[PDB]
Design an enzyme around this catalytic site. Structure first.
Site, PDB file in Angstrom:
ATOM      1  N   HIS A  15     -29.135 160.545  28.911  1.00 55.10           N
ATOM      2  CA  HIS A  15     -29.100 159.366  29.776  1.00 55.10           C
ATOM      3  C   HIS A  15     -29.517 158.094  29.055  1.00 55.10           C
ATOM      4  CE1 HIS A  15     -29.998 157.817  34.137  1.00 55.10           C
ATOM      5  NE2 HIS A  15     -28.835 157.398  33.674  1.00 55.10           N
ATOM      6  N   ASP A  23     -13.343 148.845  15.489  1.00 58.56           N
ATOM      7  CA  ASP A  23     -12.195 148.605  14.634  1.00 58.56           C
ATOM      8  C   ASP A  23     -12.627 148.558  13.159  1.00 58.56           C
ATOM      9  OD1 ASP A  23     -13.137 145.926  14.134  1.00 58.56           O
ATOM     10  OD2 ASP A  23     -12.128 145.264  15.965  1.00 58.56           O
ATOM     11  N   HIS A  94     -19.026 138.975  21.881  1.00 61.32           N
ATOM     12  CA  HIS A  94     -18.781 139.811  20.709  1.00 61.32           C
ATOM     13  C   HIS A  94     -20.027 139.910  19.844  1.00 61.32           C
ATOM     14  CE1 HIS A  94     -16.886 141.925  17.471  1.00 61.32           C
ATOM     15  NE2 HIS A  94     -17.178 140.956  16.620  1.00 61.32           N
ATOM     16  N   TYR A 118     -11.169 142.609  18.428  1.00 61.21           N
ATOM     17  CA  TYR A 118     -12.056 143.017  19.530  1.00 61.21           C
ATOM     18  C   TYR A 118     -11.793 144.428  20.060  1.00 61.21           C
ATOM     19  CZ  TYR A 118     -12.814 138.136  18.927  1.00 61.21           C
ATOM     20  OH  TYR A 118     -13.080 136.926  18.354  1.00 61.21           O
ATOM     21  N   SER A 119     -11.269 145.299  19.201  1.00 63.27           N
ATOM     22  CA  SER A 119     -11.112 146.698  19.569  1.00 63.27           C
ATOM     23  C   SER A 119     -12.408 147.429  19.262  1.00 63.27           C
ATOM     24  CB  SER A 119      -9.934 147.330  18.832  1.00 63.27           C
ATOM     25  OG  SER A 119      -8.716 146.781  19.300  1.00 63.27           O
ATOM     26  N   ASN A 120     -13.436 147.106  20.035  1.00 63.20           N
ATOM     27  CA  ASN A 120     -14.737 147.724  19.908  1.00 63.20           C
ATOM     28  C   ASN A 120     -15.229 148.013  21.297  1.00 63.20           C
ATOM     29  OD1 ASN A 120     -14.793 145.092  17.825  1.00 63.20           O
ATOM     30  ND2 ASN A 120     -15.176 147.081  16.859  1.00 63.20           N
TER      31      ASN A 120
END
Lengths: 129, 128
Positions: A15, A23, A94, A118-120
């Site tokens: 938890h 990326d 970001h 921004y592929s995170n």
């Protein structure tokens, strides 16, 4: 997941614990949390690693960069199509996404070969057991 | 190659050194040489990792399992199309391919998500 380091991270996850997928360009710290899966440009793709990791985690919340809305609508849409309506999506700057790579409860930072901006993502674990 | 560990290994590579690329089922020892790129079934593919690595290495010879010829003619053909005609292909028993994972000059064992049989290769470096 056939990845050992990932299975290991997911085994230590409870938890509130965090797990990220990033990326190719994301500046991931060079520590034990780092899991480099990158092969070459767009291999593997962010969305493919994400889909695979979701199958092995119970997630509560996800974090995305606010910038993704404008700079990568396609990725945002692919992410939404992947997770269930029950999961909450929280947008942060970001810059914050970068800080979270060193979050005290971060149990792993996965690097993909993704080149789209921004592929995170940060995945927050629900109660495991 | 954007891969950090692969890049490191290829940095310490010299003449006679080995670098291997294996399918998901190959029993790779749990040491510093191990580089696990496997994501899921057939991700990434053996052939794709091989193509990437070849672009970064000067190779002299490759090693393949004799068993590939009959159990995976497709993969053998794909490999042949990828490497030049100036590179020698040496067939050895799969059992030996496994022993080579602990070869003294082995600088890295890359694990892919490949699920087709005998998708394993050993690359021998030329002069760096």
């Amino acid at each position: 997941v056939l990845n050992e380091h990932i299975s290991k991270a997911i085994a230590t996850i409870g938890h509130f614990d965090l797990l990220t997928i990033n990326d190719a360009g994301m500046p991931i710290p060079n520590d034990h949390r780092r899991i480099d899966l990158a092969v070459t440009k767009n291999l593997p793709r962010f969305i493919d690693v994400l889909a695979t990791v979701l199958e092995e985690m119970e997630i509560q919340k996800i974090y995305l960069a606010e910038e993704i809305k404008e700079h990568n609508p396609t990725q945002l849409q692919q992410i939404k199509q992947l997770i269930s309506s029950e999961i909450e999506i929280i947008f942060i700057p970001h810059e914050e996404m970068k800080s979270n790579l060193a979050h005290p409860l971060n149990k792993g930072n996965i690097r993909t070969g993704e080149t789209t901006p921004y592929s995170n993502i940060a995945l927050e674990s629900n109660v495991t057991f």
